[PDB]
Amino acid sequence: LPAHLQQTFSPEEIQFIVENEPIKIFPRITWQLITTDDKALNNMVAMRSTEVVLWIALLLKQQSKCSIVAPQWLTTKELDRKIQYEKTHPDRFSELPWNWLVLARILFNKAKDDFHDPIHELRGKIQDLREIRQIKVLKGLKYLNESHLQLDNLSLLEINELRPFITEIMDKLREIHTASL
Amino acid sequence: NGLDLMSSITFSQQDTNNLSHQEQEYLKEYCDLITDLKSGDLVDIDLSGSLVPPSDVFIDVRVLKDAGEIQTEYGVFNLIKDSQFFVRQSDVERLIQQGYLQKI
Amino acid sequence: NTEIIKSFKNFILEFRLDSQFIYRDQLRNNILVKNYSLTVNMEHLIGYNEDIYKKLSDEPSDIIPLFETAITQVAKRISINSLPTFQLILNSNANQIPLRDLDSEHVSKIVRLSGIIISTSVLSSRATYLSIMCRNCRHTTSITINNFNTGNTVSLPRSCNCGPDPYIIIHESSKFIDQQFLKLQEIPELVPVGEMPRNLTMTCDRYLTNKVIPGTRVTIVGIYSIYNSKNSGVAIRTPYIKILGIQSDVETVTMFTEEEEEEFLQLSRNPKLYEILTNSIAPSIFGNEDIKKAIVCLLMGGSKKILPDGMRLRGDINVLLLGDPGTAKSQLLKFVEKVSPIAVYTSGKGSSAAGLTASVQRDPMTREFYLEGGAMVLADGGVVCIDEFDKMRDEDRVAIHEAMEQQTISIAKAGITTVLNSRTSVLAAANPIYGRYDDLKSPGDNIDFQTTILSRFDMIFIVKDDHNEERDISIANHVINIHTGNANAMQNQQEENGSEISIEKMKRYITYCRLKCAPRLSPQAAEKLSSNFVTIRKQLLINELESTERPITIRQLEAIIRITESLAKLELSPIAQERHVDEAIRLFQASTMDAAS
Amino acid sequence: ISQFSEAYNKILRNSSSHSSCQLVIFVSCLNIDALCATKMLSLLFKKQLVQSQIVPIFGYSELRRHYSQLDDNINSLLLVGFGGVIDLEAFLEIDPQEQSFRRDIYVLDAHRPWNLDNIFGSQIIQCFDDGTVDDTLGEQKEAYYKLLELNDLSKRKQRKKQIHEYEGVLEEYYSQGTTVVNSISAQIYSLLSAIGETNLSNLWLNILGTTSLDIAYAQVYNRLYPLLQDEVKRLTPSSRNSVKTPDTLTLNIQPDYYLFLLRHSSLYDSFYYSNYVNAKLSLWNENGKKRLHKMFARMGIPLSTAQETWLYMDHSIKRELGIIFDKNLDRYGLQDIIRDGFVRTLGYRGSISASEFVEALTALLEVGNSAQKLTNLRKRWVSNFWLSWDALDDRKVELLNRGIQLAQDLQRAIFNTGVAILEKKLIKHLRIYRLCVLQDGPDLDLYRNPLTLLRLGNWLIECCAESEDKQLLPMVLASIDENTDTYLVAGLTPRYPRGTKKPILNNFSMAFQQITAETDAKVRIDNFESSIIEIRREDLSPFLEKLTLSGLL
Amino acid sequence: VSPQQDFSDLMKSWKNERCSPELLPYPHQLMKRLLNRISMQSQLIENISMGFLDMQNESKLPLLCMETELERLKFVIRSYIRCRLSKIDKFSLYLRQLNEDENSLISLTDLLSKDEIKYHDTHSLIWLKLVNDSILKYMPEELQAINDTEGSVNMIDEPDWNKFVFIHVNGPPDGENEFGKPCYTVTIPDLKEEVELTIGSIYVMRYEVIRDLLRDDKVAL
Ligand SMILES: Nc1ncnc2c1ncn2[C@@H]1O[C@H](COP(=O)(O)OP(=O)(O)OP(=O)(O)O)[C@@H](O)[C@H]1O
């Protein structure tokens, strides 16, 4: 019996989920491990790009034996066209890595060192897009009615925290109207 | 429960008499019921603990006036008051439930 | 000048103290609030830029507008009408300054200061924006007061023939704000010398207003300056000071943080939760725990029963400290005032200049009339400390007879007859006549003559100081320990460490509690008590069978009833306990003993 | 007597295990110089993810209460601060166990002389002598190789004289002032630098660790600035700002002062509670008091401005401050204040002097928290210990401010109680040495911490003698509150006014051993620190007479 | 049969699990072999690590790495099991009422793991053992029944399929339900018309109308 949350996913859970996503890195390394579902790999070439699951990358990076690739989608200069595209589209939320919130929080824990001036940089940049995305949630949130929601593009993290909000809502709405029938 | 080696509901649920005997009967019978599921796993579970997802993997815990060492399982960590360790999430999960562990 | 804006905007954005930046958070935090406000940490500000702080400190008044007009900028970014300018409050705790010293040097200098306010003016408007038109040219214009130090700073421009200044006010289109006009006084403790304490008018605007109760101990910041006014010289201007920001010691304010409830819940769980407070009230004090205990029951506030009809139970009771000097009761109430969030210490006469009667006084200008205030009003809904109650002039002493029960004062003075509400809980410390022998006398023949004064009182205490050797030497040495090396004072740390109340938190605890629970007695407690006093009512009359003169009322029992919720309120329980009641009986029994003598 | 790396490499084969490991660092004990070296090492294994115990040992014999308590699977071991004098083969015994022994012990001590049994008889050791004083120190070679294995009556009598010759020689060594060589973290950092790792934190830690004993001379440390100064040269995060940056935001060299709580206090009291300022200016008295104010009259400083926070000092008051110092302080002999010692810069959270950074950590030691009570209280010091270890953490700075403030609370009573003592003239001049005792005072519990009177005594010894002619001398001190005349007695040594020509070491510590080898009634070596001893007032009086004579120095 | 997809669908329904308002069939067909597969390597890795001590008179990276993937994946399944434990407690009356009813599909060992079904009756058993000895004594004749009155009600609940839920449409393309313009599907609510749907967009709606598609696995949640 979970008690809490328990219906919504924990942010610690969803990040625990996003850990499962594969990404390329630059190992210092040159048994097996067989593991289970990895399928990878032959002992990896030092200073070479290879796609691997996220949390394992945290491992060798935790020993600093590996160098994680920066997301191509993660370019602050590149990200402005999104906020550019976002600032000109009051409706659409544009495009998302879909895990990216936890990433940046996690990316800057350790892997921060790999990027060029991530410091004092995207954190603000990402933050602006974070709320401008978030603000557009509530602005469209006034439209909220049963039985349909066009949620479109949103980061699941905020989607998770918003879960208790609307899920508790429309059920009232759907109930009250349908009950009214 | 609570968790090793709980090793028993004894001292746990201090209410005891304060809670109605019919229920303490039920619950004490109920916890034995979930122990039946423990026969099912065979996982191993260990669902009574392991509430938090793993990380990462090692952590530093300090004893809280707890000795010890009761650490017979695996190996003895030699419980000493005012002593922080460096250990993996796995074994910590049991002692943290037993209050012998403090810091993360 | 310009573009210094973005630098704050940078600290508005560029700034992140790891792991999370603040003011940029605070803004959106205030956004949905529609708070239209920001509280700045100035001591934090220097941490960002060292230059702009003193660069701000040079002429802070001029860079005031450089903020809220800037804060809207990204706020407007985050808003994406109409959007009124936010109200910033910057603050610092670092170097506190005495009211005793204000140097003209400090003009246009921001200064954090502690203070004790005399009072504050009723709120009045200031128009942040206005539209104005030529009474002649039909020319359309608009003006704002974007910020100000009252000057008057601005007037109607005379350039529309047409003139002079044909442009005129339009209020409807104009937009407005408020000001409190606080009058603050220095802390009494220091350093008035023989001289009377200076008093100062502090300027509170918009959100600044209504934020502080009159008479409260407060810490405030703002700018020293001078306004010529007119209503001095040659060409001398009167002193005034801006308030920004005011971060006042909490409360010094019904709301509070959530985790506070929990730590109190930790206290509410304690079996000794009441008994520890028995020690907390008297760290320096030794013995008289019964009277010591009798303190707390009144501290939580009395029974308020408003259910129809309009008849309502009062609070909080009455108590008498009467006993030979060396009672330390006046010293006691001095602790009492410190313990009450709102209380008035009165040894009079009145205290200090305060009318023991809330009284009427005329407005100097424009004649008219107003309530001049009274101690009952000053402390209303709270503690009342009284000394020399026997030395009190009996005429306004009469008003006391009313103040305690009906708890509403009314005076016909001039044209204003209105009936004020007084919810205060009074306690009488007045010394008994002729020392010990009055106990050899009737219990009465002390207060005035009649005990009708006592009638309105509830728990009246007669201190018996007996010369017992061991009893004295206990507290006797206890006295020396109170002194250097303050051995007793160091004992409280371990009492603070392990259990014992800090008593300032306790005040917050009580204030928490006082507003929290509304305990209603269990039905069997009353019948336990109904069976009780009926004996006491019957028994003391058995003492009255000798025609012995001393006393009893049904109001005597009702007072006891308020003791029921008293400690029970400390328990926080929704209903009074059966067991809980009993201590009130034996405790009031100790009070009845005073009648027994 | 071995290179650190291979010794560290030696643990590597002994390191990784499941269940791990097994080795246990010993935190021993009170002195912070071990603390930095632990975390750097603590971080070292973090890099390798090496599990192990962390024990904040306090009692000198407490390790015996522990080593004799929990040792099971430990295949390897490292200790700190101890063994440089007394042997654990005697202390533990040991008992050679299985050549290719099952367990080995790294022994950390910066104090000399090393024990005779340390280097030779390599067992758990791994003698820690490397690389400081090898030396030689060729004297220990005759203490064994000559000693071992040791008409015929002539050759027999000829050997014994040679034996007594070496015994007579060996008798001097190991009987001598126990003194620290250098901050252990430095050599550990050398090993840290040996593996190639240099962390601005880690160097800061050396900067931190180096600072630990800085209150007592250097002495090598004076040349150890540059060793660190080279490092600040070895590391330049960027050529220029790059403002702030909001993160790193890193340390830089500054004109540091013996002035206390510089950034963290009003400059006025900053002189007032500064110990170096104390006796030089005779701060306790009213006479020299105004003279400092006279310096502000020289400095052109408003008295209230001295009352002002260092945060808000005018940029003029800032930039001209040292120049004001340049034009003033030298007149009073205050010219040796300014130090180029390094300062961490947290920007938004502010820059801090490691010296100042240290003192806050020092406040953690005594506060921020029958015979069982002392173990209970010593445990509280250990209980209070980790909270101080918590203060080692970087992100947690807010908690530091308590000690940051509490340190200010310390000297307030520190500067308070001592001067009170000054009025009574309680010093016993004697002949051989200056002597003092505290029979009474408020809050001796706070004085129970050795560092309390230690910072106090140092605040005293330099106060009582600047000099203050003639002949700077070791000080006597004792104090008592409860626990039946415990009377903690800590050793004290004279301070030169910036002119330590000689090591001069320690004497009484040997002399304290003279009485502990004597009737030794109620005297207690229970202190890990040789300079500090527990004594009953009842037996200390004769202990004093026994202390007065025989004087070893 | 691929272990990734073996794990993929595991988190699939598991993510759907805590997301899910009510219970779905027990996945013994896969979870068992994994429940066995966990038993294989875990024992294997345990011994090969023991064979590592033999090299002692280097790479532990993959060592605890194996242990890493072990307990982490071992964690999720408890959330899966423990959660199902909860839902059943809430439906137990209906779960019997669904069991008591001929139609349609009983829990069996299909919808419910044998441990689950055992826990079903066992918990439900002593629970009534818990109510009977406590409140029912003191058991009025009509009140003697624990079940539909009808009303209110009880349980009955909670077969509420009507509730809205978070989802993201995704399903394998032929390159079926796609009528355009962009993509599939209907929709066609009881109280509303077609919306409709897109794999490119998350649309929250009635858990009942969507049951078919989560059954199709043509929508993420
Ligand atoms: N219970 C007590 N605890 C602490 N101090 C006491 C107590 N009783 C007497 N004293 C000491 O006796 C002195 C009494 O002085 P104080 O002025 O308080 O008398 P008082 O009772 O307030 O005077 P009055 O009777 O006129 O109101 C104080 O110095 C106080 O310390």
Short mmCIF file of all heavy atoms in Angstrom, two decimals, chain D residues 29 339-340 461 543:
data_model
loop_
_atom_site.label_atom_id
_atom_site.label_comp_id
_atom_site.label_asym_id
_atom_site.label_seq_id
_atom_site.Cartn_x
_atom_site.Cartn_y
_atom_site.Cartn_z
N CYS D 29 42.73 13.42 16.57
CA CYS D 29 41.39 13.36 17.15
C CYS D 29 40.68 14.70 17.10
O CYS D 29 39.73 14.89 16.34
CB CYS D 29 41.44 12.89 18.60
SG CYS D 29 40.18 13.71 19.60
N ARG D 339 48.93 39.57 5.67
CA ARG D 339 49.40 38.29 5.19
C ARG D 339 48.79 38.04 3.83
O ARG D 339 47.66 38.46 3.56
CB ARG D 339 49.04 37.17 6.17
CG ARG D 339 49.86 37.19 7.45
CD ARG D 339 49.45 36.06 8.40
NE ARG D 339 49.71 34.74 7.83
CZ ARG D 339 49.40 33.59 8.44
NH1 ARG D 339 48.82 33.60 9.63
NH2 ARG D 339 49.68 32.44 7.84
N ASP D 340 49.53 37.37 2.96
CA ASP D 340 49.09 37.16 1.60
C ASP D 340 48.34 35.85 1.45
O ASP D 340 48.02 35.42 0.33
CB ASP D 340 50.29 37.22 0.65
CG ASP D 340 50.84 38.63 0.52
OD1 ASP D 340 50.14 39.57 0.94
OD2 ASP D 340 51.95 38.79 -0.02
N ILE D 461 49.34 33.79 27.17
CA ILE D 461 50.80 33.74 27.11
C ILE D 461 51.41 34.87 26.29
O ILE D 461 52.43 35.44 26.68
CB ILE D 461 51.28 32.39 26.53
CG1 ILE D 461 52.80 32.31 26.57
CG2 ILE D 461 50.76 32.22 25.12
CD1 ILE D 461 53.34 30.90 26.48
N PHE D 543 51.72 17.77 42.90
CA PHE D 543 52.02 17.66 41.48
C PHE D 543 52.66 18.95 40.97
O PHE D 543 53.53 18.93 40.12
CB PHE D 543 50.74 17.34 40.69
CG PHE D 543 50.93 17.34 39.20
CD1 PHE D 543 51.30 16.18 38.54
CD2 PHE D 543 50.72 18.49 38.45
CE1 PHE D 543 51.47 16.17 37.16
CE2 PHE D 543 50.88 18.49 37.08
CZ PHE D 543 51.26 17.32 36.44
#
